[PDB]
Amino acid sequence: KKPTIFILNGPNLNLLGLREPTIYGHQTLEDIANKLKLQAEKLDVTVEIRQSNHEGALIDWLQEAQAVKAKAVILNAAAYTHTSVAIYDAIRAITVPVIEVHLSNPHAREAFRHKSYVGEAALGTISGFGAESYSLALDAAAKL
Amino acid sequence: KKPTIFILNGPNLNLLGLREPTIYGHQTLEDIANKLKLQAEKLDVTVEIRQSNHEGALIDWLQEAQAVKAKAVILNAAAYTHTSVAIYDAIRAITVPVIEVHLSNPHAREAFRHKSYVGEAALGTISGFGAESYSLALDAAAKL
Amino acid sequence: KKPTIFILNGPNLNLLGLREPTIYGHQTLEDIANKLKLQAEKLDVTVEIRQSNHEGALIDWLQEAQAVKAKAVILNAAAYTHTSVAIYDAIRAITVPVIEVHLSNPHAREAFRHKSYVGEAALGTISGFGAESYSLALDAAAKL
Amino acid sequence: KKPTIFILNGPNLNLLGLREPTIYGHQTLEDIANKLKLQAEKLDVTVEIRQSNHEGALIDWLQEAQAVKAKAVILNAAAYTHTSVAIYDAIRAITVPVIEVHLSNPHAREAFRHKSYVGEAALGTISGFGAESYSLALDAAAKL
Amino acid sequence: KKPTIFILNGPNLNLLGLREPTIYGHQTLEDIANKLKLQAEKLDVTVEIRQSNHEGALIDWLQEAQAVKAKAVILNAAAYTHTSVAIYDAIRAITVPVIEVHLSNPHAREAFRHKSYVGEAALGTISGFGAESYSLALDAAAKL
Amino acid sequence: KKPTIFILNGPNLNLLGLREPTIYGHQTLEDIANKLKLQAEKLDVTVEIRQSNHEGALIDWLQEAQAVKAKAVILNAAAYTHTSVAIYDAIRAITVPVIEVHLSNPHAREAFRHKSYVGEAALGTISGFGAESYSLALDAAAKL
Amino acid sequence: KKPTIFILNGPNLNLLGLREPTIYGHQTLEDIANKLKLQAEKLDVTVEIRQSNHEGALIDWLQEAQAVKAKAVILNAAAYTHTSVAIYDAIRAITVPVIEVHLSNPHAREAFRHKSYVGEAALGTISGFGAESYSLALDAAAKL
Amino acid sequence: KKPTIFILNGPNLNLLGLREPTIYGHQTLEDIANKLKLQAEKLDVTVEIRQSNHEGALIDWLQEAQAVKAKAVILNAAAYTHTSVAIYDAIRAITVPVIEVHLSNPHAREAFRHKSYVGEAALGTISGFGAESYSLALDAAAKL
Amino acid sequence: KKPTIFILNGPNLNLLGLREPTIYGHQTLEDIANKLKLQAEKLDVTVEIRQSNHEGALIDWLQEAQAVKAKAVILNAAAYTHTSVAIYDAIRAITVPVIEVHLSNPHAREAFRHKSYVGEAALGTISGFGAESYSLALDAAAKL
Amino acid sequence: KKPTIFILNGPNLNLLGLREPTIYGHQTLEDIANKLKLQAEKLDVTVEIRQSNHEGALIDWLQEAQAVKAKAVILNAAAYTHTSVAIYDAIRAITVPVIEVHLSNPHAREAFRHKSYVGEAALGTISGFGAESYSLALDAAAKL
Amino acid sequence: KKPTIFILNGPNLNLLGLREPTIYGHQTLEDIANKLKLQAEKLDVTVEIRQSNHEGALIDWLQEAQAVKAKAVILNAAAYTHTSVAIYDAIRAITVPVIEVHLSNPHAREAFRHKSYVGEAALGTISGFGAESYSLALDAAAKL
Amino acid sequence: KKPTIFILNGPNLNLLGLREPTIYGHQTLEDIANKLKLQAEKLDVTVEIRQSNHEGALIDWLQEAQAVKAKAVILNAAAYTHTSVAIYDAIRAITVPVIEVHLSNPHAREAFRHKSYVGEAALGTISGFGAESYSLALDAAAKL
């Protein structure tokens, strides 16, 4: 049976590479999903990739990953990283390890992004490598 | 004739008694629903019992209870208790009394759980008796 | 096409005028929608008016306004104004101008309502004029 | 032998129902003691009910309850709830379970009352039901 | 003789469009005064427009507006918005409604500008529309 | 009956004048009691003067003043002024007016003495005039 | 020629008893000036009574009092009490004792009024007796 | 001839070695008193050893030690160490040196125990050596 | 006609060397003005030296310096340094460089003087050299 | 030809796997250096691996890496991560990218470890994978 | 074999008794080393006494003490006590017990000295006895 | 002997001018040393100029300046200015006057640079004039 790895994207990440692309970058959330589905072939794992602007959806998906005995979750909660006690509790309640991922380095941004409810509950964090943040997360998650 | 009492459970409470039961406890959210439906027979009230990982669902349900002239709401908002100005506003907007319930004693935990937006708007609070927190809430709610 | 302007209402605003009208003030969210649809005829713009108790819905709608090349968004996030980093990021990610609206003056209320994640990301803010807050927002939004 | 349950009232609760009774309510601390002594007959437990304006008295009484192998303490520390590290330590030092009780909902009042040294050490808390807060506490305490 | 509307500008607004105009913008405080005097003709109100770098002058003018039974004050206290308890008290002491105005969106700027002593006492606030902030304020003020 | 005025002194005021008088200032708590008893003759009021190092004693005495329909309480809670929520509640619960008194000006001292739980509940405050603080309090208290 | 005592009133006190008098009280700032001029005859002192909405005026007047070898200043800085480091420095720089006066008890009001730059530098403070606050201040000031 | 040294124990220390001794330790407060009386023989000093759950008792005892020209006080105020401005004032008012003692290292515990009103006023502090904390204190106190 | 350099002194500096000179120092603000006018001859610049207790005057003068194309402003805002957002904005709005000057080292004083709204906007700061602080400022200002 | 990558370890990491190994883990800092030297062969890069308890050493090494045109630095500043403004400045001053590494997840520990001066200046961060944190860092660093 | 006890002195302690000795005290760091070497003869232990202005040196020495199976460390980190997370980690990593020592009582000084990273990790603390602080530490350390 | 003046540079100042000079500003730390050595000839003083990335080195050098009876220290502690209690204590312990120097205006930067442990202990501060900050410091230092 093939280990399944949830990759869960929070709000606004669906907008990646749309605002003035010849200024803020060309790469989109689908492009990253395509990269990752291929990396998952190289790594011999299936990868279930989802996005929602809803805090509740990320929790449902964390709980769904435990129900399905998933090997790992790679979680980019986006802005909910800094507000969601509920996502912190979800990660702590489930036995499936969670890896926090950010494209940008949140500590290099606004002070309100220094706070990570995900990071307080997760196994680990990879930040600041753009799409490479996901690819590193998926390698580490395969070797768990 | 029969008074209806909403009993609303927030995120992660659906996971009660699942993770390593012979370590973190056997009793489940359904077991508590079954206890409560029986207590509701002894008390001559119907009891509408619901759970969601979605903050918006608890608000919809608070508003639904006012529309239906419900006698009371027993609310365990779980993690949203500590973040939701929106749930605080919903409780204050509606005329139906709200009783805050927690299985655990939140004041005995992490400092971030000392804050209760629910408690700031509710009639009252029962904490720390596990399932008995709900049973006490339902007695008090019947005598309102 | 007449320019389209999204008008997005957050949680509990659907309860406007219902609770004890002879105390909290008669006028309802529909009444305001009706005022606005008529103002929109005088101004030669179409107006898409929505309400949800769900933080995620407001973000979906902000993103949907950019996808549809809407001219403006008038946003009353209600309690989520004070909690939502995710709405702040949605406003910043989209190119459509956002006008913050409040019926009441939030600075005249509880200290926790002094914080506006919407206001930190929006073009501008109109507060405290009840329904006239929306009408002013719609005039300003038409002239953008 | 009959289980004994201490019920300990802190400062100013002795003044309950005296200031302008036909405005702020008729019921007194004795009336509640009388209610509770009768409930204690129904429940087959003896109940030792005390009040003092002295922080030290509540600690002496907590320690006296352990010495006498009391089944439980119901504690309304009143204002000392928000200041007394010493009462927090007393509860934690003794093996007798403590139930926090408040007539009012302290979270609905001044921010300085949100802090509960009792709540940080107690098994549980019942708040906001007036005299019913004690009666619920005594039921829960009997079933311990 | 018509309703009179005071429009009071605090410190540094007199410098609008002067420093490097082909960089920080061409429009001046006089230009806005001229716009507003014309709008006031369309609206059938007299408009008394004043500027001072002195906190005391804005208070004298608020008090003068009450003495003269003005219909409204439009107040852009500029930096004093964030420091002046005295202007907060002046607004609260007088019966004449005050509308807060800002050219810029202060919530989009330095955290020290998030604080508004004016906004805490005023009827309402219009921010972020440049000169349009005043025009909106004057329309709302006429319909009061 | 001559109106009776309680004058209540908190901890350490009993040490006034004892420690190195030729440095800390000669006058003792008895000397002040003697001054006050004489002033009370000139004013036609009886004066009941007490001191305790016990927070609980000051509360008992506040409550005793209401029971005896005393005209006023002059209260120097000394260090308990900065810690006692329970004294704040006692003052608020009783109908007898309380005047706060300090020998020294506490705002001129350590930041922790800037907080006055007494001052937050009392009618009024006289600070910084040594014994004259009491004498002024007794004149004001007689005229109440 | 007699001891001269400056009595300096800060912003908004000029509005005392004007706004809806049959609601917020009938007595005015002139009435208090008249009371005080008469008390000054009984006490054998000249009294110079002034009011300004300008922080700078209160400083000029404090400095003028030192230049004229005044016996004392009675200062009600009103809102500037809570903001003015400059008035704190003026009091500290001059040799003339300053008595802080408030009509209301500021500790009984909004938390921002708990802060007193005047009180941190003054000899003493009388608060909460309305006009009696000034009369007490003038007696204490005469006996200095 | 013999120097007397007060040794004053605050709340809950009377409970030392009682709760489940074969888990939380065997040694009691009396055992430490017995150790100390013997050490006092070797050191040629009389030792007055007392305990109370009452803040006021520790103050009375500090004041009593000054009145009796005691050489030193060894003070373990327990929880009152973190709350008592009154004990801080008592230590500062008296000329008798005070040595702060703790069995445990309070800096190694909860952040609220990092604050020591005793330590802010005392000569010195010995923490974390259990009973040896007292023995060291008594040696240092004898050589003063 | 030469480069002109404004030197602006805020509140209370006019009192330098007056209060008990044989205690707090003999040198006055005029003495420093005389020093500086002579230094200005050596440096080939005109120097306009002003003092006011009014925050508004310092702003008027900063704006006047820009209008007159002054080379530089040397600003000792005294207490307004720690409160004036308005002076911060004036410095930022004008093109003329501002040098902050203090006689004393404010970082060596009360924590409230650590905050410098002037310093946050100025080119540079010279503190702690008494009159030498001005002389250094004028040399640096001439070589700009 | 060969890119050189500095790997810099701060204080106490030299102690990895020493204290009671059959309890707190077997693997040592050398073991990780050996893993990394081998990975560096597979990756075609030389790897300069160093440790110091001295903040100044990590700065010297950051500066040395720029001077030597190193491709990247992998930095585990250990405790200095939470205190060193100087290391933050060193990373910002140099052009060589820095990757922050932690064995443990610092967000899962004491609140003081949530602060990362390294993270505020670095390209990116890998936390919580033990030795795998370094291996991931070295892959990412090779592909830069 | 003789137990060895490290005694480690942080920055500026090397300057003890040099600044105006006939004012701030005659005794030097060597004098204390000489006292302690003699006490160590009485106690049958060898004592290795060191000082550095370098944070890193104290850590190296803590680690060196574990490597050498030292019985104890007596640590006066001086100013690094209030800043050094790295020294806190060093103490916690090593098995050798650490006793915190201060000549002065840090709680009696500036609020920034109330914080002790050493105290948070150490067995215990002796403060405020000058050189006697070391001698007490060495007795306690011998009896470990 | 010519009076000797230590000029001490902290971490990262050694990188001045190196990184992208055509952006960060051409001038190097050597260039400034050369300027200063020449100024020192004009002033008849010798100048001992040093730099280290080590906090401990700056303290050693402060202490070395006192040992050598240096006339003054000019200190640019760079990032350690904002962290070093130990440098604050070194300045306070030595009798040699210290002048704080910064190239940039730290108050114009990140809030964490507003804190100056050097400034809290130093005679005086010169900030924001680049190399001219040192030159002004050396003139002031010669005249001491």
Side-chain angles (χ1 to χ4, degrees), chain K residues 2 24 31 49 66 76 81 86 90 93 96 102 107 117:
Chain K
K2 256 209 246 175
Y24 304 179
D31 288 335
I49 307 189
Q66 207 200 22
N76 188 346
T81 308
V96 180
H102 309 286
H107 284 257
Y117 280 114

Side-chain angles (χ1 to χ4, degrees), chain C residues 14-41 43:
Chain C
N14 57 311
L15 302 186
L16 209 49
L18 295 177
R19 189 248 179 79
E20 225 182 337
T22 166
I23 303 282
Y24 243 61
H26 293 287
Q27 186 173 61
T28 73
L29 186 64
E30 271 289 277
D31 288 336
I32 285 175
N34 293 350
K35 258 181 141 41
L36 284 173
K37 279 158 165 165
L38 271 174
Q39 199 196 330
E41 234 167 306
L43 281 179

Side-chain angles (χ1 to χ4, degrees), chain C residues 99-108 124-130 132-134 136-137, chain E residues 73-76 81-82 91 98-107 113-114 116-129 133-134 136-137 140:
Chain C
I99 299 165
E100 192 181 6
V101 157
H102 310 288
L103 297 163
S104 68
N105 174 4
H107 281 261
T125 298
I126 306 181
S127 291
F129 304 94
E132 284 318 308
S133 291
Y134 291 88
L136 287 160
Chain E
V73 177
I74 296 165
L75 176 58
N76 188 348
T81 309
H82 319 303
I91 296 159
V98 179
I99 296 166
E100 191 183 7
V101 158
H102 310 285
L103 299 161
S104 70
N105 173 5
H107 286 260
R113 297 199 201 266
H114 294 182
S116 178
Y117 281 110
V118 170
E120 286 179 30
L123 173 70
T125 301
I126 306 175
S127 294
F129 304 90
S133 292
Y134 290 87
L136 288 161

Side-chain angles (χ1 to χ4, degrees), chain J residues 6 10-11 13 15 27 30 40 46 49 52 57 61 66 85-87 89 92 101 113 139:
Chain J
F6 281 57
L13 284 167
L15 300 189
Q27 188 177 61
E30 260 220 77
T46 102
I49 310 186
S52 174
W61 293 337
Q66 208 199 192
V85 178
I87 286 162
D89 271 350
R92 280 189 102 220
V101 155
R113 297 198 198 267
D139 278 310

Side-chain angles (χ1 to χ4, degrees), chain A residues 11-19 21 24-127:
Chain A
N12 303 303
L13 285 169
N14 57 311
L15 303 176
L16 238 208
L18 289 176
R19 186 172 193 162
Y24 304 179
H26 286 273
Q27 189 174 64
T28 73
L29 188 64
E30 190 192 281
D31 288 335
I32 284 176
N34 296 345
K35 276 190 147 38
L36 283 173
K37 288 255 182 44
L38 269 190
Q39 199 200 329
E41 234 189 322
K42 180 255 160 142
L43 280 182
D44 239 327
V45 303
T46 98
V47 108
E48 210 83 78
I49 307 189
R50 291 183 188 178
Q51 190 274 330
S52 169
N53 304 324
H54 301 249
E55 180 177 24
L58 299 175
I59 295 158
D60 301 338
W61 292 336
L62 289 162
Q63 300 184 353
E64 179 176 350
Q66 207 200 22
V68 134
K69 317 257 219 213
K71 182 153 150 83
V73 178
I74 294 162
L75 175 60
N76 188 346
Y80 290 138
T81 308
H82 318 303
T83 60
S84 189
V85 175
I87 286 165
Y88 159 92
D89 271 343
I91 296 161
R92 278 189 95 231
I94 75 178
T95 40
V96 180
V98 182
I99 296 169
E100 191 180 9
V101 157
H102 309 286
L103 298 159
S104 70
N105 172 5
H107 284 257
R109 295 181 65 199
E110 316 109 305
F112 67 80
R113 298 198 201 267
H114 295 183
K115 177 70 178 181
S116 177
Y117 280 114
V118 169
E120 286 179 38
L123 172 68
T125 302
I126 304 174
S127 291

Side-chain angles (χ1 to χ4, degrees), chain E residues 11-15 18-19 51-55 78-80 82-83 109-110 112-113, chain I residues 54-57 59-60 63 66 83-86 88-95 117 120:
Chain E
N12 301 301
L13 287 166
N14 56 311
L15 300 186
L18 286 176
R19 125 97 101 196
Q51 190 275 330
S52 168
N53 304 321
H54 300 253
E55 175 180 23
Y80 289 140
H82 319 303
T83 59
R109 293 179 72 194
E110 317 107 306
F112 66 82
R113 297 199 201 266
Chain I
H54 300 253
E55 175 180 23
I59 295 157
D60 300 333
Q63 300 186 357
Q66 207 202 27
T83 59
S84 189
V85 179
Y88 161 90
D89 272 348
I91 296 159
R92 280 189 93 226
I94 73 178
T95 314
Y117 281 110
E120 286 179 30

Side-chain angles (χ1 to χ4, degrees), chain K residues 3-19 21 24-84:
Chain K
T4 98
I5 292 174
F6 280 57
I7 306 184
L8 300 180
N9 293 300
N12 303 303
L13 285 169
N14 57 311
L15 303 176
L16 238 208
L18 289 176
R19 186 172 193 162
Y24 304 179
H26 286 273
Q27 189 174 64
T28 73
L29 188 64
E30 190 192 281
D31 288 335
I32 284 176
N34 296 345
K35 276 190 147 38
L36 283 173
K37 288 255 182 44
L38 269 190
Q39 199 200 329
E41 234 189 322
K42 180 255 160 142
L43 280 182
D44 239 327
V45 303
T46 98
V47 108
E48 210 83 78
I49 307 189
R50 291 183 188 178
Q51 190 274 330
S52 169
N53 304 324
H54 301 249
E55 180 177 24
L58 299 175
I59 295 158
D60 301 338
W61 292 336
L62 289 162
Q63 300 184 353
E64 179 176 350
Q66 207 200 22
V68 134
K69 317 257 219 213
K71 182 153 150 83
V73 178
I74 294 162
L75 175 60
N76 188 346
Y80 290 138
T81 308
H82 318 303
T83 60
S84 189

